[PDB]
PDB file of C-alpha atoms and ligand atoms in Angstrom:
ATOM      1  CA  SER A   1      15.910   0.378   8.925  1.00 38.65           C
ATOM      2  CA  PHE A   2      12.592  -1.680   9.435  1.00 38.14           C
ATOM      3  CA  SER A   3      12.234  -3.269  12.891  1.00 40.67           C
ATOM      4  CA  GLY A   4       9.939  -5.837  14.497  1.00 41.74           C
ATOM      5  CA  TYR A   5       8.828  -7.478  11.258  1.00 38.89           C
ATOM      6  CA  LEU A   6       8.056 -11.130  10.878  1.00 40.30           C
ATOM      7  CA  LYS A   7       9.714 -12.589   7.751  1.00 40.01           C
ATOM      8  CA  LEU A   8       7.117 -14.435   5.593  1.00 39.91           C
ATOM      9  CA  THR A   9       9.242 -15.157   2.512  1.00 40.52           C
ATOM     10  CA  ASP A  10      12.637 -14.174   1.021  1.00 39.95           C
ATOM     11  CA  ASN A  11      11.238 -10.670   0.261  1.00 39.38           C
ATOM     12  CA  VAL A  12       7.950 -10.173   2.145  1.00 39.79           C
ATOM     13  CA  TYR A  13       7.865  -8.995   5.791  1.00 39.93           C
ATOM     14  CA  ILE A  14       4.859  -8.181   8.009  1.00 41.09           C
ATOM     15  CA  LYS A  15       4.207  -6.214  11.208  1.00 42.03           C
ATOM     16  CA  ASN A  16       1.159  -5.202  13.262  1.00 40.33           C
ATOM     17  CA  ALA A  17       1.610  -1.448  12.934  1.00 41.77           C
ATOM     18  CA  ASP A  18      -0.069   1.798  11.995  1.00 41.29           C
ATOM     19  CA  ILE A  19       1.477   2.563   8.549  1.00 43.74           C
ATOM     20  CA  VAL A  20       1.441   6.347   9.384  1.00 42.17           C
ATOM     21  CA  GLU A  21       3.399   5.793  12.617  1.00 44.11           C
ATOM     22  CA  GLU A  22       5.660   3.347  10.802  1.00 42.38           C
ATOM     23  CA  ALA A  23       6.336   5.836   7.988  1.00 42.23           C
ATOM     24  CA  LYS A  24       7.071   8.720  10.442  1.00 44.68           C
ATOM     25  CA  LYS A  25       9.516   6.422  12.288  1.00 43.81           C
ATOM     26  CA  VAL A  26      11.353   4.800   9.331  1.00 42.69           C
ATOM     27  CA  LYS A  27      10.873   7.630   6.737  1.00 46.16           C
ATOM     28  CA  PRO A  28      11.232   4.955   3.995  1.00 48.81           C
ATOM     29  CA  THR A  29      12.177   5.681   0.383  1.00 46.90           C
ATOM     30  CA  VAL A  30       8.644   4.578  -0.627  1.00 43.34           C
ATOM     31  CA  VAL A  31       5.406   4.384   1.278  1.00 38.89           C
ATOM     32  CA  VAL A  32       2.500   2.816  -0.635  1.00 38.09           C
ATOM     33  CA  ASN A  33      -0.904   4.425  -0.447  1.00 33.66           C
ATOM     34  CA  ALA A  34      -4.110   2.425  -0.920  1.00 33.68           C
ATOM     35  CA  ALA A  35      -5.337   4.950  -3.480  1.00 33.93           C
ATOM     36  CA  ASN A  36      -8.449   5.241  -5.635  1.00 34.42           C
ATOM     37  CA  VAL A  37      -8.393   6.334  -9.326  1.00 35.62           C
ATOM     38  CA  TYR A  38      -9.258   9.933  -8.390  1.00 33.91           C
ATOM     39  CA  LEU A  39      -6.579  10.154  -5.649  1.00 33.83           C
ATOM     40  CA  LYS A  40      -9.373  11.264  -3.267  1.00 34.45           C
ATOM     41  CA  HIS A  41      -7.771  10.313   0.078  1.00 33.08           C
ATOM     42  CA  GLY A  42     -10.935  10.255   2.161  1.00 34.10           C
ATOM     43  CA  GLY A  43     -10.727   7.202   4.378  1.00 37.98           C
ATOM     44  CA  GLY A  44      -8.850   4.011   5.209  1.00 40.62           C
ATOM     45  CA  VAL A  45      -5.091   4.110   4.713  1.00 42.62           C
ATOM     46  CA  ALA A  46      -5.372   7.022   2.190  1.00 45.28           C
ATOM     47  CA  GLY A  47      -7.299   9.233   4.594  1.00 44.76           C
ATOM     48  CA  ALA A  48      -4.843   8.446   7.375  1.00 47.98           C
ATOM     49  CA  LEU A  49      -1.723   9.100   5.234  1.00 45.36           C
ATOM     50  CA  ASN A  50      -3.241  12.297   3.858  1.00 45.01           C
ATOM     51  CA  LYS A  51      -4.231  13.545   7.354  1.00 44.58           C
ATOM     52  CA  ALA A  52      -0.618  12.934   8.500  1.00 43.70           C
ATOM     53  CA  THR A  53       0.611  15.235   5.678  1.00 46.55           C
ATOM     54  CA  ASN A  54      -1.761  18.029   6.862  1.00 42.03           C
ATOM     55  CA  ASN A  55      -3.640  17.585   3.506  1.00 41.69           C
ATOM     56  CA  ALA A  56      -0.499  18.321   1.428  1.00 43.26           C
ATOM     57  CA  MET A  57      -0.898  14.877  -0.173  1.00 41.54           C
ATOM     58  CA  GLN A  58      -4.443  15.784  -1.296  1.00 38.76           C
ATOM     59  CA  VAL A  59      -3.389  19.202  -2.676  1.00 42.55           C
ATOM     60  CA  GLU A  60      -0.576  17.561  -4.661  1.00 42.44           C
ATOM     61  CA  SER A  61      -2.922  14.773  -5.793  1.00 41.94           C
ATOM     62  CA  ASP A  62      -5.588  17.194  -7.028  1.00 42.89           C
ATOM     63  CA  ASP A  63      -2.985  19.000  -9.162  1.00 39.61           C
ATOM     64  CA  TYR A  64      -1.814  15.587 -10.512  1.00 42.84           C
ATOM     65  CA  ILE A  65      -5.411  14.542 -11.463  1.00 43.51           C
ATOM     66  CA  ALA A  66      -6.161  17.981 -12.973  1.00 45.83           C
ATOM     67  CA  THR A  67      -3.150  17.506 -15.282  1.00 46.03           C
ATOM     68  CA  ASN A  68      -3.279  13.772 -15.986  1.00 47.77           C
ATOM     69  CA  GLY A  69      -6.782  12.500 -15.335  1.00 50.39           C
ATOM     70  CA  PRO A  70      -7.610   9.490 -13.205  1.00 51.80           C
ATOM     71  CA  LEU A  71      -5.406   6.468 -12.724  1.00 51.22           C
ATOM     72  CA  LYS A  72      -6.517   3.026 -13.931  1.00 50.54           C
ATOM     73  CA  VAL A  73      -7.645   0.376 -11.390  1.00 52.59           C
ATOM     74  CA  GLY A  74      -4.456  -1.703 -11.038  1.00 55.09           C
ATOM     75  CA  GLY A  75      -2.269   1.306 -11.858  1.00 57.95           C
ATOM     76  CA  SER A  76      -0.115   3.660  -9.873  1.00 59.24           C
ATOM     77  CA  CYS A  77       1.695   6.931  -9.804  1.00 56.60           C
ATOM     78  CA  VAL A  78       4.699   8.189  -7.815  1.00 54.12           C
ATOM     79  CA  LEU A  79       4.203  11.428  -5.938  1.00 51.43           C
ATOM     80  CA  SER A  80       5.947  13.077  -2.943  1.00 51.90           C
ATOM     81  CA  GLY A  81       6.061  11.222   0.348  1.00 51.46           C
ATOM     82  CA  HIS A  82       5.791  14.605   2.163  1.00 47.39           C
ATOM     83  CA  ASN A  83       6.698  14.131   5.885  1.00 46.14           C
ATOM     84  CA  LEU A  84       6.179  10.348   5.649  1.00 43.45           C
ATOM     85  CA  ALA A  85       8.620   9.065   3.028  1.00 45.37           C
ATOM     86  CA  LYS A  86      10.809  10.235   0.099  1.00 44.64           C
ATOM     87  CA  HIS A  87       8.006   9.108  -2.282  1.00 49.59           C
ATOM     88  CA  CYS A  88       4.478   7.890  -2.062  1.00 48.34           C
ATOM     89  CA  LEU A  89       3.548   5.199  -4.545  1.00 45.00           C
ATOM     90  CA  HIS A  90      -0.227   5.600  -4.940  1.00 41.75           C
ATOM     91  CA  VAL A  91      -1.470   2.175  -6.005  1.00 38.78           C
ATOM     92  CA  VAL A  92      -5.102   1.471  -6.983  1.00 39.90           C
ATOM     93  CA  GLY A  93      -6.217  -1.970  -5.972  1.00 36.52           C
ATOM     94  CA  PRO A  94      -9.722  -3.081  -7.053  1.00 35.27           C
ATOM     95  CA  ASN A  95     -12.473  -1.972  -4.702  1.00 32.63           C
ATOM     96  CA  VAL A  96     -14.818  -4.951  -4.326  1.00 32.52           C
ATOM     97  CA  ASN A  97     -17.405  -2.584  -2.598  1.00 31.43           C
ATOM     98  CA  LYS A  98     -17.528  -0.531  -5.893  1.00 37.33           C
ATOM     99  CA  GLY A  99     -17.998  -3.839  -7.874  1.00 33.96           C
ATOM    100  CA  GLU A 100     -14.439  -3.839  -9.263  1.00 34.67           C
ATOM    101  CA  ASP A 101     -12.647  -6.914 -10.658  1.00 35.80           C
ATOM    102  CA  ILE A 102     -10.619  -8.695  -7.890  1.00 40.53           C
ATOM    103  CA  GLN A 103      -8.444 -10.173 -10.719  1.00 39.10           C
ATOM    104  CA  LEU A 104      -6.817  -6.659 -10.990  1.00 41.60           C
ATOM    105  CA  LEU A 105      -5.158  -7.156  -7.563  1.00 39.47           C
ATOM    106  CA  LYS A 106      -2.155  -8.914  -9.193  1.00 35.89           C
ATOM    107  CA  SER A 107      -1.720  -5.966 -11.623  1.00 39.44           C
ATOM    108  CA  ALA A 108      -1.913  -3.571  -8.667  1.00 41.24           C
ATOM    109  CA  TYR A 109       0.849  -5.483  -6.777  1.00 37.72           C
ATOM    110  CA  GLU A 110       3.042  -5.523  -9.935  1.00 39.52           C
ATOM    111  CA  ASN A 111       3.551  -1.773  -9.419  1.00 38.55           C
ATOM    112  CA  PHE A 112       5.602  -2.629  -6.284  1.00 39.37           C
ATOM    113  CA  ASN A 113       8.238  -4.356  -8.488  1.00 36.82           C
ATOM    114  CA  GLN A 114       9.397  -0.963  -9.777  1.00 35.64           C
ATOM    115  CA  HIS A 115      10.785  -0.126  -6.269  1.00 35.99           C
ATOM    116  CA  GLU A 116      13.574  -2.011  -4.475  1.00 36.72           C
ATOM    117  CA  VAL A 117      12.021  -1.582  -1.053  1.00 39.12           C
ATOM    118  CA  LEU A 118       8.587  -0.397   0.081  1.00 38.00           C
ATOM    119  CA  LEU A 119       6.526   0.139   3.229  1.00 36.57           C
ATOM    120  CA  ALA A 120       2.971  -0.897   2.252  1.00 36.54           C
ATOM    121  CA  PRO A 121      -0.501  -1.844   3.319  1.00 38.99           C
ATOM    122  CA  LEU A 122      -2.284  -4.959   1.946  1.00 35.66           C
ATOM    123  CA  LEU A 123      -3.905  -3.816  -1.298  1.00 37.88           C
ATOM    124  CA  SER A 124      -7.695  -3.939  -1.588  1.00 36.70           C
ATOM    125  CA  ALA A 125      -7.959  -4.867   2.123  1.00 36.79           C
ATOM    126  CA  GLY A 126      -9.982  -2.804   4.671  1.00 31.70           C
ATOM    127  CA  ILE A 127     -12.565  -0.486   3.167  1.00 30.70           C
ATOM    128  CA  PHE A 128     -11.685  -1.792  -0.349  1.00 29.59           C
ATOM    129  CA  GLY A 129     -13.573  -5.002   0.579  1.00 27.11           C
ATOM    130  CA  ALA A 130     -11.249  -7.796  -0.523  1.00 26.33           C
ATOM    131  CA  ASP A 131     -10.197 -10.725   1.686  1.00 23.31           C
ATOM    132  CA  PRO A 132      -6.873  -9.678   3.316  1.00 22.57           C
ATOM    133  CA  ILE A 133      -5.693 -13.341   3.343  1.00 19.30           C
ATOM    134  CA  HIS A 134      -6.120 -13.377  -0.466  1.00 17.92           C
ATOM    135  CA  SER A 135      -4.336  -9.982  -0.722  1.00 15.18           C
ATOM    136  CA  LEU A 136      -1.326 -11.306   1.219  1.00 15.71           C
ATOM    137  CA  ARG A 137      -1.206 -14.411  -1.011  1.00 13.75           C
ATOM    138  CA  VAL A 138      -1.253 -12.252  -4.186  1.00 15.20           C
ATOM    139  CA  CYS A 139       1.401  -9.993  -2.640  1.00 16.88           C
ATOM    140  CA  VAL A 140       3.784 -12.884  -1.895  1.00 15.77           C
ATOM    141  CA  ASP A 141       3.158 -14.452  -5.326  1.00 13.66           C
ATOM    142  CA  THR A 142       3.579 -11.167  -7.268  1.00 16.32           C
ATOM    143  CA  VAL A 143       6.014  -8.848  -5.514  1.00 13.83           C
ATOM    144  CA  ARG A 144       9.677  -9.735  -5.975  1.00 13.36           C
ATOM    145  CA  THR A 145      11.125  -6.588  -4.374  1.00 14.89           C
ATOM    146  CA  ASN A 146      11.410  -6.094  -0.568  1.00 17.14           C
ATOM    147  CA  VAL A 147       7.968  -5.286   0.820  1.00 15.38           C
ATOM    148  CA  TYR A 148       7.353  -4.420   4.501  1.00 15.69           C
ATOM    149  CA  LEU A 149       3.657  -4.823   5.176  1.00 15.88           C
ATOM    150  CA  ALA A 150       2.021  -2.843   7.949  1.00 15.79           C
ATOM    151  CA  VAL A 151      -1.281  -4.384   9.145  1.00 14.58           C
ATOM    152  CA  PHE A 152      -3.164  -1.998  11.461  1.00 14.61           C
ATOM    153  CA  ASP A 153      -5.588  -4.495  12.996  1.00 14.31           C
ATOM    154  CA  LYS A 154      -3.890  -6.909  15.578  1.00 15.99           C
ATOM    155  CA  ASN A 155      -6.585  -9.564  15.195  1.00 16.30           C
ATOM    156  CA  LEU A 156      -6.234  -9.500  11.402  1.00 18.73           C
ATOM    157  CA  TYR A 157      -2.386  -9.528  11.699  1.00 16.33           C
ATOM    158  CA  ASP A 158      -2.590 -12.677  13.887  1.00 17.22           C
ATOM    159  CA  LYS A 159      -5.046 -14.295  11.476  1.00 19.65           C
ATOM    160  CA  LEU A 160      -2.750 -13.431   8.504  1.00 18.37           C
ATOM    161  CA  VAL A 161       0.374 -14.875  10.172  1.00 13.96           C
ATOM    162  CA  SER A 162      -1.328 -17.981  11.623  1.00 10.12           C
ATOM    163  CA  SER A 163      -2.947 -18.879   8.276  1.00 13.08           C
ATOM    164  CA  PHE A 164       0.092 -18.053   6.068  1.00 13.59           C
ATOM    165  CA  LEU A 165       0.986 -20.959   3.872  1.00 11.27           C
TER     166      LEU A 165
HETATM  167  C1  K2G B   1       4.667  12.223 -17.298  1.00 13.37           C
HETATM  168  C2  K2G B   1       4.231  12.304 -15.835  1.00 13.37           C
HETATM  169  C3  K2G B   1       3.080  13.284 -15.667  1.00 13.37           C
HETATM  170  C4  K2G B   1       3.845  10.954 -15.269  1.00 13.37           C
HETATM  171  N1  K2G B   1       3.224  10.084 -16.086  1.00 13.37           N
HETATM  172  C5  K2G B   1       2.844   8.922 -15.533  1.00 13.37           C
HETATM  173  C6  K2G B   1       3.071   8.619 -14.199  1.00 13.37           C
HETATM  174 CL1  K2G B   1       2.568   7.080 -13.564  1.00 13.37          CL
HETATM  175  C7  K2G B   1       3.715   9.592 -13.434  1.00 13.37           C
HETATM  176  C8  K2G B   1       4.048   9.421 -11.974  1.00 13.37           C
HETATM  177  N2  K2G B   1       3.870  10.500 -11.200  1.00 13.37           N
HETATM  178  O1  K2G B   1       4.479   8.341 -11.555  1.00 13.37           O
HETATM  179  N3  K2G B   1       4.105  10.761 -13.968  1.00 13.37           N
END
């Protein structure tokens, strides 16, 4: 199962890892994507996960949006995990760089409670512009299911662990 994680709480674990490499290694039931409402996987975690699927994630996502329309900020959808996981849970955290409401981060993390165990990034972190320390706090205070967080940046991982209350 998941290896090398630091246990933060009863159900939240964290590791300095590339979520793509982690997903290819574990092949978890659920990998979370840091999605946008359009499922346009251009950069950050979404661009990296999509590139690992040879764009199959984007082709599937475009068919999903053509049928259903965009997701809501704070919402999610379950699609295939392709070569990375059984499923991909595409979760839309607020993008602070697009002037979106940071209060929607708790709603975004609530999507994780529909899955017993997940491999995930910190929502709204990175190119989404939120403070990753705040994202980890919301994660631990919202998610009740088993969440294995992959933090790509070593310096951020160390800052997250050393400042964890
Ligand atoms: C009825 C189908 C199209 C549906 N409705 C809503 C969602 Cl959120 C999902 C999903 N892929 O998780 N699928």
